Design a protein around this nucleic acid. Structure first.
Lengths: 314, 314
DNA sequence: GATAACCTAAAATTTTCTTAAAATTATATGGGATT
DNA sequence: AATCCCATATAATTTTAGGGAAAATTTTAGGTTATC
């Protein structure tokens, strides 16, 4: 429609076969517009300067670079649907955000081999968090995503062949409760269990107690449960991680990286295998990446000296 | 710009900063449009059926699958300019070519180690083609593209460090004759020389004779010269390889792959290093690829068995 | 007198070059358990 | 009595998901010359 908020509203109904988290996402952006000057402006009067200044206010509001850069993409697509409908001729969001803003994103550093051992040793000895020692060993040893872990049921483990069958994730959102989703990439993948993780899974099965009646979209007997008898979710693990890391840094001189969350374990897992010289496409299959490019980002850039040594070695 | 030919002529004049080879290529496609019924049609009367039926005629004419897919990309770009100028609404070339034609491209198989050994041995014993042994040894050992090799001069070799400095390519075309271009991507890169490549350049420098007065775009003293005293070109190495391979297959039971050309040397170089497990980003620097995806195609797909094996080795 | 090498013009083929959804994480807040 | 743990709603950040052809390389036809 005419105003920007109305154009985005039409763009949302146009492409409405989205998942619940996407619905929440679009809702968030829809509110930013309804509060920003850009929201009530006729799209036929939105120039390149108006869009760039919008990114500035977003920054002045407090939003991060990637948040604004993704919202810029949501709006850029909305203005391409209005051009495909002959409402304007030039997309005011077709510009590089790095020209208007500096990318001050926080670097996500994985754990060094030494940090990983200290961190693991602490969890194992901590009276409050040692119960989560298994899940963390499993995260560091498989690269699983947090909701991929939370979806693991009995029928997803092959202890005879020592394989993990990753075919889904368990999610939870306000109102809608729990649901099962597809990884979105089919996208199934099998992960082998090294000795350390093998024992970890076996210990979790043996120590499971108090699971309440719970079957969702055909899945039951989940491995990782909250104290309340229902399965764990990303929020539960993320919140626990935060308390654990703050507890660790209090008794250790060298704190853990500011970004030590459940995904840091995935990042650590991949970085280690890449630095150890693992086959790129094999690491890709294990990580479950759709594009080999995302996997290759974990590989340090090469230099002539770097390349020359590789050829002298081969 | 009513007819497709007029539209394409405008797209070429619009985007005019191109290199000579590009001019020839555009001219080739232009002749096709002039000889095909599609060329004389008004652009606002070209449906999605007209486009596919054009692909069928191109294939029936004999043009390869890749040739047609590239020409479709050129026409699709022209029709996206006509749409940006309020002339059409739907791009008739926005469709997958695999739905209309079968991709029957000849696979480009590299040389097995034994094939390479046999090929090299043959070249070194042939009275006619042994003078090209050094150049072919350099290709297999460096991965240079053919015109990158032709473009090499004395000021491009660092015998002290045993490095090759690739910064340009030497080309020739009917009319303009020789000229110096760029890798067209910082295409500059340094390739280390192994023992066999070092001795190879050493022989080419010592055995050089009869170079005629020649300097182009500031480059003189080229290493690989034709029997006429002027530098070699891709066409020169192309035709020579054609005879050389047709001669080899006459005296060996197992013929060389159909696509055994100067690029096949570059293909072999890359596959070998990739198969031996070279750092993928280091191999990219050597090959001169811009997108790591290009380098990654030389790596065989991974399966669960493949991935579990790597994870066991680590 | 045949072929094969070689050269070049013309033509062909091949190599090469995020238009956000959907997840994960941080935070404010409350009741209950711990030091 | 101050403090941490756990839980959940709300809000924010992060991870993840191709060719809008140019420019090269290769093939071939046709001719001369060297070779067998």
């Amino acid at each position: 429609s005419m105003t920007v908020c109305q154009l985005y509203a039409k763009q949302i109904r146009h492409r409405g076969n989205v998942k619940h988290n996407t619905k929440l996402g679009r809702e968030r952006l829809m509110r930013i517009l309804e509060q920003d000057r850009l929201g009530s402006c006729p799209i036929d009067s939105v120039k390149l300067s108006d869009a760039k200044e919008w990114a500035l206010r977003m920054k002045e509001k407090g939003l991060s670079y990637k948040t604004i850069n993704n919202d810029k993409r949501s709006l850029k697509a909305a203005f391409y649907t209005a051009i495909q409908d002959d409402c304007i001729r030039k997309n005011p969001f077709d510009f590089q955000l790095s020209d208007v803003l500096d990318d001050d994103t926080e670097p996500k550093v994985p754990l060094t081999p030494a940090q990983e051992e200290s961190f693991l040793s602490f969890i194992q000895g901590d009276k409050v968090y040692q119960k989560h020692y298994d899940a963390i060993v499993i995260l560091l040893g498989t690269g699983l995503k947090i909701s991929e872990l939370c979806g693991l049921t009995d029928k997803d483990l092959d202890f005879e062949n020592r394989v993990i069958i990753v075919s889904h994730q368990l999610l939870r959102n306000t109102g809608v409760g729990y649901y099962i989703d597809e990884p979105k990439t089919s996208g199934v993948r099998k992960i082998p269990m090294n000795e350390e993780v093998y024992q970890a899974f076996q210990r979790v099965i043996k120590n499971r107690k108090g699971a309440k009646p719970f079957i969702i979209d055909g899945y039951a007997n989940f491995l990782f449960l909250k104290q309340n008898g229902y399965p764990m979710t990303a929020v539960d693990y993320g919140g626990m991680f935060g308390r654990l890391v703050k507890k660790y840094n209090k008794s250790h001189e060298e704190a853990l990286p500011k970004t030590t969350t459940p995904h840091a374990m995935r990042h650590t897992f991949c970085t280690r295998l890449a630095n150890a010289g693992m086959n790129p496409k094999a690491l890709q299959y294990i990580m479950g990446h759709s594009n080999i490019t995302m996997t290759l980002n974990y590989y340090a850039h090469a230099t002539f000296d770097s390349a020359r040594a590789e050829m002298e070695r081969l």
